[PDB]
Design an enzyme around this catalytic site. Structure first.
Site, PDB file in Angstrom:
ATOM      1  N   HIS A  66       2.282   4.790   5.165  1.00  0.00           N
ATOM      2  CA  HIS A  66       2.568   3.722   4.207  1.00  0.00           C
ATOM      3  C   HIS A  66       1.954   4.056   2.852  1.00  0.00           C
ATOM      4  O   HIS A  66       1.167   5.003   2.738  1.00  0.00           O
ATOM      5  CB  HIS A  66       2.208   2.298   4.722  1.00  0.00           C
ATOM      6  CG  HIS A  66       0.745   1.976   4.761  1.00  0.00           C
ATOM      7  ND1 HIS A  66      -0.076   2.353   5.803  1.00  0.00           N
ATOM      8  CD2 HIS A  66      -0.016   1.217   3.939  1.00  0.00           C
ATOM      9  CE1 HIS A  66      -1.278   1.836   5.624  1.00  0.00           C
ATOM     10  NE2 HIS A  66      -1.267   1.140   4.499  1.00  0.00           N
ATOM     11  N   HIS A 116      -0.332   2.675   0.797  1.00  0.00           N
ATOM     12  CA  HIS A 116      -1.707   2.456   0.393  1.00  0.00           C
ATOM     13  C   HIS A 116      -2.491   3.751   0.205  1.00  0.00           C
ATOM     14  O   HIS A 116      -2.224   4.764   0.860  1.00  0.00           O
ATOM     15  CB  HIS A 116      -2.384   1.490   1.367  1.00  0.00           C
ATOM     16  CG  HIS A 116      -1.951   0.066   1.181  1.00  0.00           C
ATOM     17  ND1 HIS A 116      -2.191  -0.924   2.107  1.00  0.00           N
ATOM     18  CD2 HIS A 116      -1.294  -0.535   0.156  1.00  0.00           C
ATOM     19  CE1 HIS A 116      -1.706  -2.070   1.668  1.00  0.00           C
ATOM     20  NE2 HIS A 116      -1.155  -1.861   0.485  1.00  0.00           N
ATOM     21  N   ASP A 170      -5.328   4.844   1.053  1.00  0.00           N
ATOM     22  CA  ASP A 170      -6.048   5.482   2.135  1.00  0.00           C
ATOM     23  C   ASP A 170      -5.125   6.369   2.951  1.00  0.00           C
ATOM     24  O   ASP A 170      -5.596   7.234   3.688  1.00  0.00           O
ATOM     25  CB  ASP A 170      -6.725   4.432   3.028  1.00  0.00           C
ATOM     26  CG  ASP A 170      -5.735   3.545   3.750  1.00  0.00           C
ATOM     27  OD1 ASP A 170      -4.810   3.020   3.102  1.00  0.00           O
ATOM     28  OD2 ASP A 170      -5.889   3.362   4.973  1.00  0.00           O
ATOM     29  N   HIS A 225       1.758  -4.570   8.560  1.00  0.00           N
ATOM     30  CA  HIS A 225       0.602  -4.377   7.704  1.00  0.00           C
ATOM     31  C   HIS A 225       1.117  -4.204   6.260  1.00  0.00           C
ATOM     32  O   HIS A 225       0.467  -4.612   5.301  1.00  0.00           O
ATOM     33  CB  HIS A 225      -0.150  -3.119   8.137  1.00  0.00           C
ATOM     34  CG  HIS A 225      -1.216  -2.695   7.179  1.00  0.00           C
ATOM     35  ND1 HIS A 225      -2.475  -3.249   7.176  1.00  0.00           N
ATOM     36  CD2 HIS A 225      -1.205  -1.772   6.192  1.00  0.00           C
ATOM     37  CE1 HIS A 225      -3.200  -2.682   6.230  1.00  0.00           C
ATOM     38  NE2 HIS A 225      -2.454  -1.781   5.618  1.00  0.00           N
ATOM     39  N   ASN A 274      -7.142  -6.188   5.669  1.00  0.00           N
ATOM     40  CA  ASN A 274      -6.528  -6.466   4.382  1.00  0.00           C
ATOM     41  C   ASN A 274      -5.068  -6.748   4.659  1.00  0.00           C
ATOM     42  O   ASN A 274      -4.332  -5.877   5.130  1.00  0.00           O
ATOM     43  CB  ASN A 274      -6.644  -5.272   3.436  1.00  0.00           C
ATOM     44  CG  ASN A 274      -5.730  -5.402   2.232  1.00  0.00           C
ATOM     45  OD1 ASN A 274      -5.795  -6.388   1.496  1.00  0.00           O
ATOM     46  ND2 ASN A 274      -4.864  -4.411   2.032  1.00  0.00           N
TER      47      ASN A 274
HETATM   48 ZN   LIG Z   1      -2.826  -0.338   4.061  1.00  0.00          ZN
END
Ligand SMILES: [Zn+2]
Ligand SMILES: [Zn+2]
Length: 230
Positions: free
Chosen positions: A83, A85, A87, A148, A179
């Site tokens: 995904h 994000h 990280d 998520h 989150n």
């Molecule tokens: Zn994430």
């Protein structure tokens, strides 16, 4: 036996043999006061290696490549970020400079761009519709729908029955939602169910963070998402 933040100091990475030709990569992350382990996946593809997600950032990802180069010795030729994000895509530039071909769905690439995060170079077509699945070397890429994140993908290694859920799946030790800023809480459960219906045979389920388990992690995640919604 499964590496925890206790065996992995910040900035370092450790690999764990889940099955033949299948490993999880664990990196300790430090965020907003706390320290926790983040999981990634590595799947032997012939004589090469397919990497699933970075170790969050340049330094950590560079350490990831180094730990792969010495523990396994095979060249990482392709990489998939589950995904947008930071990280999960942070470290892509490092991967790209090392000769790794980085992949991600058009949905993920678009979101990363808007977010100002690193952008995997190649695009993974055929995953824009919930329930879509496509073969990618030694694994199957699956889009269960928003959870998520609206773009999260899960990875299944048919040869080893290993399912990597990314942040779409929580570990048992997580009692509350993490989150969920970019999450679709309304759809998360239904997305989990699609994962359940598509991989009823999964034997090893790897959460985005923490200890792996069985398919019960799906229900756990669903239990945690449900409670948060209420
Ligand atoms: Zn994430
Ligand atoms: Zn390329």
């Amino acid at each position: 036996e499964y590496p925890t933040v206790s065996e992995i100091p910040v900035g370092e990475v450790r690999l764990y043999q889940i099955a033949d030709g299948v490993w999880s990569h664990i990196a300790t992350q430090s965020f907003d006061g706390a320290v926790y382990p983040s999981n990634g996946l590595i799947v032997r593809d012939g004589d090469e290696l397919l990497l699933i997600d970075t170790a969050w950032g340049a330094k950590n990802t560079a350490a990831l490549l180094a730990e792969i180069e010495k523990q396994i010795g095979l060249p990482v030729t392709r990489a998939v970020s589950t995904h947008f994000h930071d990280d999960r895509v942070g470290g892509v530039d490092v991967l790209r400079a090392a000769g790794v071909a980085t992949y991600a769905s058009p949905s993920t690439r678009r979101l990363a761009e808007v977010e100002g995060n690193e952008i995997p170079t190649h695009s993974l077509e055929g995953l824009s519709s919930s329930g879509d699945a496509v073969r990618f070397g030694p694994v199957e890429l699956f889009y269960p729908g928003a959870a998520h994140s609206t773009d999260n993908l899960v990875v299944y290694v048919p040869s080893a029955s290993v399912l990597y859920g990314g942040c779409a799946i929580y570990e048992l030790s997580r009692t509350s939602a993490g989150n969920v800023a970019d999450a679709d809480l309304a759809e998360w459960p239904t997305s989990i169910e699609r994962i359940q219906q598509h991989y009823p045979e999964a034997q090893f389920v790897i959460p985005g963070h923490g200890l792996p388990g069985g398919l019960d992690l799906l229900k756990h995640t669903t239990n945690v998402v449900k409670a948060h919604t209420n």
